[PDB]
Design a protein around this motif. Sequence first.
Motif, PDB file in Angstrom:
ATOM      1  N   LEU B   1       0.722  -1.189  -0.197  1.00 51.08           N
ATOM      2  CA  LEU B   1       0.014  -0.010  -0.081  1.00 51.08           C
ATOM      3  C   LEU B   1       0.924   1.287   0.154  1.00 51.08           C
ATOM      4  N   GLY B   2       2.201   1.298  -0.435  1.00 49.38           N
ATOM      5  CA  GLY B   2       3.138   2.332  -0.551  1.00 49.38           C
ATOM      6  C   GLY B   2       2.657   3.367  -1.322  1.00 49.38           C
ATOM      7  N   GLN B   3       1.624   3.147  -2.096  1.00 48.96           N
ATOM      8  CA  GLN B   3       1.414   3.890  -3.224  1.00 48.96           C
ATOM      9  C   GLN B   3       0.258   5.083  -2.536  1.00 48.96           C
ATOM     10  N   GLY B   4      -0.649   4.623  -2.001  1.00 44.91           N
ATOM     11  CA  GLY B   4      -1.785   5.467  -1.594  1.00 44.91           C
ATOM     12  C   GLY B   4      -2.746   6.052  -2.514  1.00 44.91           C
ATOM     13  N   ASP B   5      -2.164   6.637  -3.474  1.00 41.63           N
ATOM     14  CA  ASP B   5      -3.137   7.330  -4.558  1.00 41.63           C
ATOM     15  C   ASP B   5      -3.886   6.278  -5.389  1.00 41.63           C
ATOM     16  N   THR B  36      -9.005  -0.931 -14.208  1.00 37.78           N
ATOM     17  CA  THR B  36      -9.579   0.308 -14.183  1.00 37.78           C
ATOM     18  C   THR B  36      -8.946   1.398 -13.364  1.00 37.78           C
ATOM     19  N   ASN B  42      -2.254   7.501 -10.762  1.00 30.28           N
ATOM     20  CA  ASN B  42      -1.045   7.707 -11.042  1.00 30.28           C
ATOM     21  C   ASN B  42      -0.341   6.566 -11.512  1.00 30.28           C
ATOM     22  N   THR B 107     -13.750   8.090   8.144  1.00 30.15           N
ATOM     23  CA  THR B 107     -13.875   9.280   7.130  1.00 30.15           C
ATOM     24  C   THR B 107     -15.153   9.362   6.276  1.00 30.15           C
TER      25      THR B 107
ATOM     26  N   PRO C 204       1.686   9.800  -4.402  1.00 28.31           N
ATOM     27  CA  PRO C 204       1.207   8.943  -3.853  1.00 28.31           C
ATOM     28  C   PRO C 204       2.003   8.726  -2.624  1.00 28.31           C
ATOM     29  N   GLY C 205       1.282   8.883  -1.449  1.00 31.78           N
ATOM     30  CA  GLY C 205       1.842   8.660  -0.048  1.00 31.78           C
ATOM     31  C   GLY C 205       1.139   7.516   0.458  1.00 31.78           C
ATOM     32  N   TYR C 206       1.692   7.063   1.754  1.00 31.66           N
ATOM     33  CA  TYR C 206       1.363   5.914   2.678  1.00 31.66           C
ATOM     34  C   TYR C 206      -0.148   6.505   3.135  1.00 31.66           C
ATOM     35  N   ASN C 209      -4.036  10.448   1.351  1.00 26.72           N
ATOM     36  CA  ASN C 209      -4.295  10.230  -0.162  1.00 26.72           C
ATOM     37  C   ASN C 209      -5.698  10.775  -0.748  1.00 26.72           C
ATOM     38  N   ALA C 216     -10.947  15.061   7.940  1.00 22.05           N
ATOM     39  CA  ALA C 216     -11.624  14.597   9.179  1.00 22.05           C
ATOM     40  C   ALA C 216     -10.734  14.133  10.276  1.00 22.05           C
ATOM     41  CB  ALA C 216     -12.043  13.164   8.701  1.00 22.05           C
TER      42      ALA C 216
END
Lengths: 78, 110, 368, 368
Positions: B1-5, B36, B42, B107, C204-206, C209, C216
């Motif tokens: 999961l180091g991409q996040g985006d 998709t 990115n 969230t 793109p971070g941990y 995002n 929140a």
Amino acid sequence: FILLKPVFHCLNEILDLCHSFCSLVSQNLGPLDERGAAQLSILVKGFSRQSSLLFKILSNSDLAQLLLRLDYNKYYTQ
Amino acid sequence: LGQGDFIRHLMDLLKPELVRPATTLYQHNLTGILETAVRATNAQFDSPEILRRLDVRLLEDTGWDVFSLDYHVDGPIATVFTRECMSHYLRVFNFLWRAKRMEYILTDIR
Amino acid sequence: REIITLQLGQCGNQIGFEFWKQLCAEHGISPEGIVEEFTDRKDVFFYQYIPRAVLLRVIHSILNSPYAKLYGNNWASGFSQGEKIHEDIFDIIDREADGSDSLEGFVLCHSIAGTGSGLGSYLLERLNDRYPKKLVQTYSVFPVQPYNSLLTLKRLTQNADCVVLDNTALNRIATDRLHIQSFSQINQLVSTIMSASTTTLRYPGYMNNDLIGLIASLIPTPRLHFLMTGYTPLTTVLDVMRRLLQPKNVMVSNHCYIAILNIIQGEVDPTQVHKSLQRIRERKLANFIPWGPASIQVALSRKSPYLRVSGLMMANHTSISSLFERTCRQYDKLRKREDNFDEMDTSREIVQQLIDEYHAATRPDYIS
Amino acid sequence: REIITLQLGQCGNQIGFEFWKQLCAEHGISPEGIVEEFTDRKDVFFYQYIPRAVLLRVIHSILNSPYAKLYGNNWASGFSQGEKIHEDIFDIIDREADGSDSLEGFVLCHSIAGTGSGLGSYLLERLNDRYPKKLVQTYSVFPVQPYNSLLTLKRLTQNADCVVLDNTALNRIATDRLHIQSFSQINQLVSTIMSASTTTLRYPGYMNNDLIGLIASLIPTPRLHFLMTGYTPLTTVLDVMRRLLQPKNVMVSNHCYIAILNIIQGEVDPTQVHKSLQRIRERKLANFIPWGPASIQVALSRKSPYLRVSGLMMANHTSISSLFERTCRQYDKLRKREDNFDEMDTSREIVQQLIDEYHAATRPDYIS
């Protein structure tokens, strides 16, 4: 899928299936009354069974195929 | 999961699917969703080779208990991972997947 | 996800134009909207490249600049004119929202001091009514002036889902360490904060995002949605983390924090971060709310290769209530000095509720 | 299997002549009807070369063209004359039928506005009478004018076993991307539309080797036999399919599709085509019926080397029912504004049925 035996032995049943149905419509010009309807409901009990039977088979290469049939998620309701 | 985006968009698209029970889940449908996400985020600007190995696998409930990525690797590079790093990453990926949906729930409430 | 930015009034267009100029350089995008040769996520703000902007006399200065290839004074007059062109300006946004892949928010850049004050308050009511699932973050800028200042405050306390930048603290920092004595010189400082505020949505971070991730975390309760900024370098992380808590840098003219977010845009060592937080807890440089468990968050980032250690601080401080009393007090002095004039006291009533809401937040029994 | 064309009225004869112009130039056939030296199977539209056309003042203009070697206003005024010379013209059709190896269909090119409106109405009935075994496709064109249009529908709704081209929408494309303000100019797009509509028939391919091979996918039931068109080039496959479904490109003035066909006339790499559908389906950019299982059709072709990637899309959208309403809505205004006047009344009923069938088709329970 020519070498893949299970799918090739299931779709094959779909192949000769249409021969029967198409003949049934062409072998007459009136409504399906003289035991045609009696013969009509025979295949749908097998076809629709063969239809969803194939569906479990695909659930490597089938991804390109099952995507097209499932564009409207109709088999998802099957 | 180091991409996040990329994982952000991937958790928004699997939401309508994984809520259903696992019995109605079939792998051939999710790949179109994963493909998709890699196109929209990115992650599209990326080496085509490594993108060829990234796929999905179905662990064997609910859709949020059997989904996980695999990234299979075979060949010479498979002598660094040796079937044990791939049995450890998946052991990690669950803890990072749970701690990621437990946040996007909180969230949404907020 | 995408974010469409709206710029209102003279203040909005300029600080918005300086915002896009700083971002277009951060990325490898030439002023004529062509990628230069020379990994950074640019789909959130740019549309495949064109910025997702909606600009609203000053426009001609933008059209004559080299960046042409990239696209009264009463609050009542500002609110009235927006009512007349409701369908016109809402036709360029609808297509901008629909045409978007999956809209996420509506960044708004405006100053509450004349038309951007009114027309800004008008769009803020229509936006929430049209879409209730879309976040509206507003980069308001603080300065008949007392009237228009609190009127928008009424709209900003119930409509906007989330950053104040007051010109007074901008003037003080300008004369202190920049020696300006000018609008074109203070804008270089605000745009440095904006491009740094969303430094966790372009890479793109941990964690953080999504835009709802930055919001929140800080905002505990939908009423307490005012944040302030801190930006030191105008070296270890302990030096930056200590310089940010100095009131000489906080851009704001008992009291305690609710949550802090630190942004480190350098190449700093990733293991020493916990060591700095430990010494912060010992020396006790910051105090927080007594009721709920509050922590401080710090996130690292990577500077663009095409475009040193910096640092930004996002925190939700209860001292922001002081700014409101200044606007509130000046109003009552004007109310005794001069169709129904009942819209003002309703605004005056609701803003006083927030102030009491803040002063009750710093008590050990803020709940109920 | 050969297909002969039929051209009526001013519009039909003008576009068909140009339809051949684009077609003969697409092959190596000089205007004097001979092959130039300079693969493409030309049996469907040419006989050995001569085109299988049947044309019916303007003929002088055509006979004066360099192509001399290539061969009332009320609906009642048109229908009356057609019955009188019935046996005269049906000699031409008959002699052209047996002269053909295996006749397959009858393309018809006419405008529903005046002699073509009635004569076409007369033809379609008589054509079904003599020939019950022949497909009948028509390239009808849409705009006392309303009365002529409604009468043609009554015939087109039950006779023609299979496209719409509206000038008002076509004329809007002219002022936007061609800046004409001319029939001789707006017709140019029609030729590009018509020629591209039948690309897979002339170039030898795996499938789609007959008109039945194309239309049978779209029309699910003989009541829903209407289509609309789309054409993007005015460069990957995803670039194409996205630009097709945009409402700015289609030639039309809740609602959902029934089936979609895609014609690709470029040299694109065919490995990514299945990828575009994946991403396109995920984007869920277009909605579909919930009752019937269908998909989106995509077919490749090759551009004429004697003449870069193009693309055309065939659509059967339930939104076309809206257009009919306008005609019916106007007529009802005329019926209250002014030998039996019952034929118009019966047609008024049968056209209303089609509007319901489309409206009922967008339901989860259209069937039964």
